[PDB]
């Protein structure tokens, strides 16, 4: 339980393998950031925040689209305690030529892969969710 | 230039590709050692080496001496495939090779033996030059032209763009390096300079 | 594929050994120990002629050469071609490595090479087992 989000990350794609949703998951202050900034793009049925203390409970409720097909086709974290890879906000890579998105913490608040390119802010840029 | 004898080369290359030829005073089908037999089939490497059969006889575009501007301007503009076919005939030995003053294929390179010496530059009795924007093979230093080169002032007119013969020099060099159209017909691009890089 | 113990403990490469280990070498007498050289060119001076019979894959007959290199060791050769140099005691230009189908021999002869010229029954080869001044 040392990474409070770790498996939970790909549990999106390892829960919606056949587009399925029966998986309730635990919280963070970034499990108040992991599932809250891609609803910016209509990606979740509901994660509004975690409503408990002690980093509790949360319905994952992963929105699925109109072609029936994996909203999250595949997904990896490349940022875990035990894998610390820190880069700048300039050559943040091209996430499938920009087809994917990133949602991550920065060195000046909280941003996305829509901010690093136009704000020069960020630290351990995390993943490629698609 | 020649390096041997040629005119059996109807079925070796296509043809020298910028004249009339010496092809068919005979059966021009069988290329070699096939006289009572079928044709030659297709490949890519059989294709590739057919390409360079029609490169090393077409011009004196000898290997280990010509690909070089292809890789040289591989830092300059465009996928260098047709750049090459316009990088092997954008010389004053080509802006004056279609100029029609030769009767041997070697006489567009030998247009200047004692023909066209000083094209705004120093007397150079050679095949080739460095044919930059507006670069000719122009009038001779202490002469103008000879009776083996000026004997064909416009021996065939309509000689290509950037070979616009303002005559008694027998060459035209209008603008720049040449758009590779007015040169071999059945040739390709990814089978001229996309066969060489491997 | 985990990188902690990777600077704690490293990995290897493959495992290969180069070609002709008792070759590319010139044996000392002053300081008694060999030279790791990989020289382009070298000599061969003869001790016997040599021939073994049992040949399966070809199943014709042809001999080879037993030429000793420097200063007391077994060095063995073969003459790949249709030319028989019924000779010995020569001083030559070595060819390094083995041709197909002879184990343990890695030392050969260039055409000409200061000892003889070659099997003079060749005139079309113009580049095999002795062939100089050949009309092209």
């Amino acid at each position: 339980m040392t990474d409070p989000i770790a498996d939970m990350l790909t549990r999106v794609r390892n829960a919606n393998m056949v587009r399925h949703e029966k998986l309730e998951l635990p919280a963070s202050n970034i499990k108040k950031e992991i599932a809250e900034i891609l609803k910016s793009e209509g990606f979740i049925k509901n994660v509004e925040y975690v409503e408990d203390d002690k980093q509790g409970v949360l319905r994952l409720f992963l929105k699925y689209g109109q072609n029936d097909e994996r909203v999250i086709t595949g997904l990896k974290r490349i940022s875990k305690p035990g894998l610390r890879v820190y880069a700048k906000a300039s050559e943040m890579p091209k996430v499938l030529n920009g087809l994917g998105i990133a949602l991550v913490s920065t060195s000046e608040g909280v941003i996305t892969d829509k901010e690093a390119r136009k704000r020069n802010v960020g630290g351990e840029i995390i993943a490629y969710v698609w | 230039r020649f390096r041997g004898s040629n005119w059996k080369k109807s079925r070796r290359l296509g043809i020298s590709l910028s004249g009339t030829g010496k092809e068919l005073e005979k059966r021009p089908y069988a290329p070699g050692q096939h006289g009572p037999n079928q044709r030659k089939k297709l490949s890519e490497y059989g294709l590739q080496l057919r390409e360079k059969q029609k490169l090393r006889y077409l011009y004196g575009m000898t290997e280990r001496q010509f690909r070089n501007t292809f890789d040289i301007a591989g830092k300059k503009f465009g996928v260098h495939g047709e750049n090459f076919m316009i990088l092997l005939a954008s010389r004053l030995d080509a802006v004056v090779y279609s100029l029609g003053l030769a009767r041997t294929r070697r006489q567009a390179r030998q247009l200047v033996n004692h023909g066209h010496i000083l094209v705004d530059g120093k007397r150079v009795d050679i095949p080739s030059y460095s044919v930059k924007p507006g670069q000719t093979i122009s009038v001779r230093e202490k002469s103008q032209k000879l009776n083996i080169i000026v004997e064909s002032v416009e021996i065939n007119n309509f000689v290509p763009e950037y070979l616009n013969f303002d005559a008694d020099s027998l060459t035209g060099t209008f603008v720049r390096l040449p758009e590779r159209s007015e040169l071999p017909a059945e040739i390709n691009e990814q089978l001229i300079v996309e066969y060489y890089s491997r | 594929p985990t990188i902690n113990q990777l600077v704690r403990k490293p990995r290897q490469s493959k495992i290969k050994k180069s070609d002709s280990p008792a070759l590319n070498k010139g044996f000392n007498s002053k300081k008694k120990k060999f030279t790791d050289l990989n020289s382009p060119q070298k000599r061969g001076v003869c001790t016997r002629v040599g021939t073994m019979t049992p040949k399966k894959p070809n199943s014709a007959l042809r001999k080879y050469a037993r030429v000793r290199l420097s200063n007391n060791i077994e060095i063995n050769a073969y003459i790949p071609g249709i030319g028989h140099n019924l000779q010995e005691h020569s001083v030559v230009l070595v060819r390094g490595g083995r041709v197909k189908d002879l184990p343990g021999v890695r030392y050969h002869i260039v055409r000409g090479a200061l000892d003889t010229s070659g099997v003079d029954g060749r005139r079309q080869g113009r580049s095999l087992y002795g062939t100089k001044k050949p009309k092209n």
């Binding site: - | - | 990188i3 902690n4 990777l6 600077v7």
Partner: protein
Amino acid sequence: NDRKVYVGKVVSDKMDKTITVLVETYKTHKLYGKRVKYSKKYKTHDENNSAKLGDIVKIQETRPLSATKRFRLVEIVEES
């Protein structure tokens, strides 16, 4: 061009100020990239004071004025 505030901790000591301070830093190798932390030992000195059993301090790079020792600085954290 001034002189740094090198710091550290202490391990042991011998008769009449054979003093020392620990040295360490954040950095990595060029090959297989892990955040493994690393150290090397130094040579400061006092009358007898900066010494074992708790001397979290600073050190210097100056004229040593010393045998093969090198430092004159002690800028502390605390004691035990």
